[PDB]
Amino acid sequence: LCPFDEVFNATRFASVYAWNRKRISNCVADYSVLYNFAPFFAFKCYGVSPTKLNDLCFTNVYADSFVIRGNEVSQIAPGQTGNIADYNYKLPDDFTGCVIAWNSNKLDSKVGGNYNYLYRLFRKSNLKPFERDISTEIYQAGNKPCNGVAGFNCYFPLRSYGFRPTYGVGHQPYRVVVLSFELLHAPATVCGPK
Amino acid sequence: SLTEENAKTFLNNFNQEAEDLSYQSSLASWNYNTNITEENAQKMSEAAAKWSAFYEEQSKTAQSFSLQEIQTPIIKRQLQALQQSGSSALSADKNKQLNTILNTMSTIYSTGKVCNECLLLEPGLDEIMATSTDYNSRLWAWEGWRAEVGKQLRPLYEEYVVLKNEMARANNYNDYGDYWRGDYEAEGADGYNYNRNQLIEDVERTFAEIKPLYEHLHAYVRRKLMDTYPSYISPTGCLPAHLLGDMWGRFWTNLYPLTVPFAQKPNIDVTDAMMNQGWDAERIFQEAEKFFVSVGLPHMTQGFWANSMLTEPADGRKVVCHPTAWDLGHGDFRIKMCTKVTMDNFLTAHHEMGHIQYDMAYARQPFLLRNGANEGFHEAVGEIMSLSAATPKHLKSIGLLPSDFQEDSETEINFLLKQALTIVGTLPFTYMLEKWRWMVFRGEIPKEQWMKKWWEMKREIVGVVEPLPHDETYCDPASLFHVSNDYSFIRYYTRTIYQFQFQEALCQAAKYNGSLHKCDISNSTEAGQKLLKMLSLGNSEPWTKALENVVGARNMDVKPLLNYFQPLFDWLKEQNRNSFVGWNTEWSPYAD
Ligand SMILES: *[C@@H]1O[C@H](CO)[C@@H](O[C@@H]2O[C@H](CO)[C@@H](O)[C@H](O)[C@H]2NC(C)=O)[C@H](O)[C@H]1NC(C)=O
Ligand SMILES: *[C@@H]1O[C@H](CO)[C@@H](O)[C@H](O)[C@H]1NC(C)=O
Ligand SMILES: *[C@@H]1O[C@H](CO)[C@@H](O)[C@H](O)[C@H]1NC(C)=O
Ligand SMILES: [Zn+2]
């Protein structure tokens, strides 16, 4: 059995820019275990059908988990742009996989404030499909050469989330997992149930 | 390499930090309002100080981006909404002096007492001016108040005016009046451009059409008060300032028992009908939510029923006990209200929920644009809801009035009169006070003729005569809360105009055939999507375009106001035949 339980029922998820990636290979993939993790805010599969997932086999199933706001859940989709899928985690155009997303207010919200989840806001250029950036360099906005200090035309790229339970439904913490299937010429070792 | 993208990045960073700092400040303020303690007050003060420091630092940092290079309209508007400094333009010494003068005036107004009984402003004076009908019992209190508070605030107000003029000139303005009229300044296309100096030409123009109705109402009130005041009212004279149901005369609602068209048919009250059915605060809020959803507005958030304090706490918490609609941010909308099962609270619940529905509309706009079009717009969206929820047709649909009841003419006339005593009677006083403050700040009125010109305008605009002579030693304008404490007062006239404009625009869109005051926007999804077109813009567009999106006009219009009281206007014109509509500006109660 593939470790799908340790991806959706984890204890602490990573940030959006440092999205946690896990490779799933050499194991029977039971696609029926995805359910039972609460009514999902989103269960959108691109290029495949959520029903016939047990009727095929892929070489590798990459699982990318990250926490984002509620209004930014729609930005995790091929083609769409915004503030999340431009400098933190961009999806390929011809993406054949499944994006699941569910609220996690009870687990990832503190009364004082859960400032542990960070997100990149400023960057020189947009990212590429399946690219990670963990740099903490000052964003040189203007022509003034920044010297590691913050101020005018020198802003910090990584900001923090003010997750609190008093938020509404669009700013609460939402955990999003992305399962991307790979079909290289290598022999398939990840099949469904029997 | 262009400054446009740099300004965009700066605004993005400012909004990202403000959506957290202002949220923390609002949360601290709410925690203070929940349980008023010494620690919560300190936390709220620290949060407000941090927010103000951040805002002034960003404003000092934002002034390095002139609006001439910014081509994008929304970016230019966001930069303009932040470059405005305000009181920080003055030096440290002048700012400290102005703050000390403001605090001293606020302390004098809050700790004012009139004794020859010995009471204060709110406990005894308000009740006497509202309920008591004796001539001397009101005259002595009025004279004592306007002789103590006026003479104690005059020397401070004389320097306050100069300090405010200096602050205005320091912010590239001319006078304090022009600074207060800067909120109605719009920018955009050739038709969507409004100027500050253009407002003065409209507020007067809008006053000419409401003059005959106000004259008829004043004549009717005078004829009705002649009975209770036989030897103190002239048939062709003005009314004393202490016989208006209030210390200043802002609202004439206290004169309803003395000025009633038909006493044998009182107004409609649903208090007992609501108590019989066993309703409560949560039921009132659910009915208000159903009313707001029926017209076609978004649904309330789940946190509104959990984190908001809809009822009075029984855990011993001391609240201010007044209605307020708080928008903390990030989808946090709450209502703090001393809600009961009464009818006035039932209408206030629909009034305050309108502000919440407004705040839930422009949430998609940037933080520098999360506000109404002007000071007269935000308070105008919630007021029209009560006008539609307080109709005899809406009360029968909900279940407060039985189906066997029928609308009567005398009851409608009494209701229109009671509404005009509060809505129509406050417009001339507001206009006169604003004109006086504008002409004083502009230096047109010399400092040796403040009281003279004030009482001269009291006779020509409002038609109020003083019962005793008051020389320049007093300062009666400063006796008002909005004048003593720094606050704008022209917003009420614009609100009163815009509420009737919106009411007419939303009633003509639903194809309603009847009186304007008996409209009912319920069961009309077209009246919500048309209003949401303006509520979703907020401050991202000039107020002229926001007003055109609803009513079509790009300026104030008083014709909807005259159509609201048209039956009452005809009734007053028919009843005031055996009288002279108007007043001569020479009669004086103190003179023989
Ligand atoms: C009365 O006011 C006090 C403020 O001192 C409240 O105590 C706070 O309660 C909130 C919510 O539980 C928390 O911040 C802390 O537990 C308290 N803060 C501090 C600084 O002690 C108290 O909750 C209020 N009473 C009620 C019934 O709410
Ligand atoms: C997740 O794990 C916890 C503890 O192991 C368990 O109680 C819970 O039922 C799990 N969730 C699901 C959907 O099985
Ligand atoms: C308004 O709609 C409600 C439910 O949609 C209905 O019960 C009520 O009778 C309607 N009122 C009128 C006047 O049509
Ligand atoms: Zn209010």
In three-state form (DSSP H/G/I as H, E/B as E, the rest C), the secondary structure along chain A is CCCCHHHHCCCCCCCCCCCEEEEECCCCCCCCCCCCCCCCCEEEEECCCCCHHHHCEECEEEEEEEEECCCCCCCCCCCCCCCCCCCCCCCCCCCCEEEEEEECCCCCCCCCCECCCEEECCCCCCCCCCCCCCCCCCEECCCCCCCCCCECCEECCEEECCECCCCCCCCCCEEEEEEEEECCCCCCCEECCC
CB atoms within 10 A of CB A173: 23
| Facing residue for A153 by CB, picked from B6, B16, B20 | B6
A119 and A47 assigned to the same domain: no
Mutate to test the interface with B, among A87, A118, A167, A172 (most CBs of B within 10 A): A167
Which experimental approach was used here?
cryo-EM
What is the domain range of residue A129? 113-164
A118 and A38 assigned to the same domain: no
B317 and B417 assigned to the same domain: yes
CATH of the domain at B257: 1.10.1370.30
A61 and A75 assigned to the same domain: yes
Element (H, E) at B138: helix B135-170
Number of structural domains in chain B:
2
A64 and A151 assigned to the same domain: no
B346 and B466 assigned to the same domain: yes
Backbone angles phi, psi at B573, to 5 degrees: -65, -35
CB atoms within 10 A of CB B451: 20
Task: Give CA–CA dist A13/A176, Å, rounded.
Answer: 10
Residue B71 burial by Cβ neighbours in a 10 Å radius (0-12, 13-18, 19+): exposed
A40 and A88 assigned to the same domain: yes
Backbone angles phi, psi at A177, to 5 degrees: -115, 140
A46 and A7 assigned to the same domain: yes
A60 and A103 assigned to the same domain: yes
B60 and B103 assigned to the same domain: no
B124 and B50 assigned to the same domain: no
Number of structural domains in chain A:
2
Element (H, E) at B324: strand B324-327
A72 and A88 assigned to the same domain: yes
B53 and B101 assigned to the same domain: no
B163 DSSP assignment: H
B173 and B310 assigned to the same domain: yes
B110 and B66 assigned to the same domain: no
Of B46, B65, B84, which marks where a domain is finished? B84
Q: DSSP assignment of B40-80, as one string?
A: HHHHHHHHHHHHHHHHHHHHHHHTTS-TTT---HHHHHHHH
- Specify the residue for token string 């705040």: B359
B545 DSSP assignment: H
A102 and A193 assigned to the same domain: yes
A35 and A107 assigned to the same domain: yes
B23 and B119 assigned to the same domain: no
A14 and A87 assigned to the same domain: yes
CB distance A168–B331 less than 8 Å? Answer: yes
Q: What is the A174 CA–ligand 2 centroid distance (Å)?
A: 18
A160 and A188 assigned to the same domain: no
- Looking from the CA of residue A36, the nearest atom of ligand 2 is 13
**B397 within ligand 3 shell (Cβ under 6 A):** yes
B37 and B166 assigned to the same domain: no
Written as six digits, the tokens of B447 are 């400092």
Backbone angles phi, psi at B75, to 5 degrees: -65, -40
Of B84, B100, B130, which marks where a domain is finished? B84
**B523 within ligand 3 shell (Cβ under 6 A):** yes
B436 and B499 assigned to the same domain: yes
What is the domain range of residue B29? 3-84
Helix (H, G, I), strand (E, B) or coil at B524: coil
Among all ligands shown, which has an atom nearest to the Cα of B325?
A: 4
Tell which residue, B576, B262, B578, has the closest CA to residue B417.
Answer: B262
**A160 within ligand 2 shell (Cβ under 6 A):** no
Task: Give CA–CA dist B407/B591, Å, rounded.
Answer: 48
* Contact status, residue B325 vs residue A184, Cβ threshold 8 Å: no
Element (H, E) at B215: helix B211-228
B482: annotated active-site residue: yes
B486 and B509 assigned to the same domain: yes
Resolution in units of Å: 3.0
B267 and B221 assigned to the same domain: yes
